Amino acid sequence: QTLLDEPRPGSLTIGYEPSEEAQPTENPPRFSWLPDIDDGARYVLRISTDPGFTDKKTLVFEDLAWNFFTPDEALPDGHYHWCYALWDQKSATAHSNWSTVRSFEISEALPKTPLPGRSARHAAAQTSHPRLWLNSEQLSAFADAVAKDPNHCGWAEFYEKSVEPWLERPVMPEPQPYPNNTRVATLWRQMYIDCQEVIYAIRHLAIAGRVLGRDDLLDASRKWLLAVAAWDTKGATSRAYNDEAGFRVVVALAWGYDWLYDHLSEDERRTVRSVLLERTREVADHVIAHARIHVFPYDSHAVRSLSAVLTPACIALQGESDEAGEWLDYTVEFLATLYSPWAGTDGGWAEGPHYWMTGMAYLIEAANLIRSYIGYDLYQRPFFQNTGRFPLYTKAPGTRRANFGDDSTLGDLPGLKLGYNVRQFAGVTGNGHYQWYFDHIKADATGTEMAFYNYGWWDLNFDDLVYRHDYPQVEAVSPADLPALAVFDDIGWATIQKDMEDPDRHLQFVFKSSPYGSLSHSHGDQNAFVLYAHGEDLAIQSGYYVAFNSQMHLNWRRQTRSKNAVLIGGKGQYAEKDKALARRAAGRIVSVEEQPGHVRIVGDATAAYQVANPLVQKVLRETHFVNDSYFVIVDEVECSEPQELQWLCHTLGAPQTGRSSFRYNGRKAGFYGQFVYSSGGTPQISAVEGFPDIDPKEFEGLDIHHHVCATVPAATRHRLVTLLVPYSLKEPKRIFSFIDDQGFSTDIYFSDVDDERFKLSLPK
């Protein structure tokens, strides 16, 4: 008997799930285990209520191709055990010892989301073409419906905006290598934009041809398709040379092959298929063998190619490639089982809302294609049921700098695709708040549709056509009744929204203390907050995108010093390049409490500071949202040796400072901050301009931002209480405070101008 190797998990691998440390969130559970030493191993999985795994009480899933699995049926409520072994295909038996036994509970509260097995999915997949978006029955019904009314699903708008332009256009010439195979940003981008247009032309002409019964459009589509099929698979548009170009060529070939299938001669089909298979194999070998996302599921670049590239290519190829059958199974099973380690059960996305936009964009495409083709609906999984609200609470219309993480749009209004993604989730859930969000994001942002960051990535007219055909339209509902508080526990984000519909009263507050640390597109921003109030960005996410790996990115935006957060002993949270340490440099939401007039959120960022400073023993931050009007921030820090405390807050313009306060006024709103209590000593307050130690060429011609720094003398214990009062410039506000520090606790009494009161009581 072979001895099964059961490797230790790492910071960037899958874990062994389900278990008592990781109870299932769905029924049936999503199973994963680290693979044996032999990468060409097959597995057998056993599930039983009997931890002895007696034959009659046990479910057995034999001959599994991969180290992850979702069963095709929900389990009865109860207590279960599971193990796995290596499986010998020929003799039909386990050829290794059984793994560690792990346990889990199934209750009725768990959403029931089974994955139809390989046989059922293969049987559900029709043999005819087309397959992508519409089957032949649907295509027929849609053609009849467009014959009776050219405005059916907005077809007339789609034809005009997304088909018509390609009728005049000469077939895109094959992209050329760079001067001396040395990549330049302009040429790299133009190249993948060129390949994106090849998707649009081939796909939209073919669709128009089939919908309108027009052979001439089919002929025009075919012309682009054969030209692209003739491009050098080892040339400039290969995955190896420019993967962005390579990805797009595969998608173009897939839509053309699928929708022109019957229009192409058998020989033309052979030409296209051969090149489609060859290019698809390049992508599949990268996702499966190199990126190895079934072991390393955080690789979003590889997950994107699985979703956006593999899905359409493999669907187009079904029945005419055994390889493609296997790659489609992997794709479907991966999205059903392992997608995604960035996703929280409450709908949060650990990388932040900008990366939610791009990530969801390509997940949505895969899910829509798969639902149509085999009738399996990924959106039924609870993450997708919940995730529409993440951008609703972190990227509300009008907010520019009021969230966290890498954001290529930082400083601008929320991107169009955020609304479009959320509309998809409106369709799924029937939620009218999601529709409202779509309407308002679109209104604020349209006119940027043809800009390279949208046009080079998705045709929104096609998104519309597909959405209107596939989903019932949801009526927008005012966010006036939207819950003020949304907690995303798994990722450690807490958000408050007030008066979202009102441009003069709208508040967006977000607090972050994440178990994900500074990993990947997250920063050293645990126990940090951002604040948009009275319709303006006040306490901001600072700096500019510039580029990944710029000084602005690495030395400002990743670092705690750019955040509305504390520094201890002159040091921030670990935010360098070591991925394991980045993940270790973590926070967590300790508690959230809510009653009328008082929201209390507690964050613990101890590990986050400890990684870079072993002197640190405890780092807690409380944020109080008081009487729907102002904030009280409580910073509690313990160290083994005297360390000073710095309290930072960032703004678009220069703050003015005082003896125990600072103030910033923007265009229509403003806020003041006051240090009402500091056990470690009276804070010294400074206003700082710009981005220290950052190359000014990186932000040339752009306005500098500012921050206030309040420094408390070195102490082993800090308790700092900061009152933050936002206001409309039309009605500036003042909050009064009294400290009662006698007793076993420090009591702070707050009152407004109408003697409305709040009492903070902090045990000593």
Ligand SMILES: [Cl-]
């Ligand atoms: Cl979450």
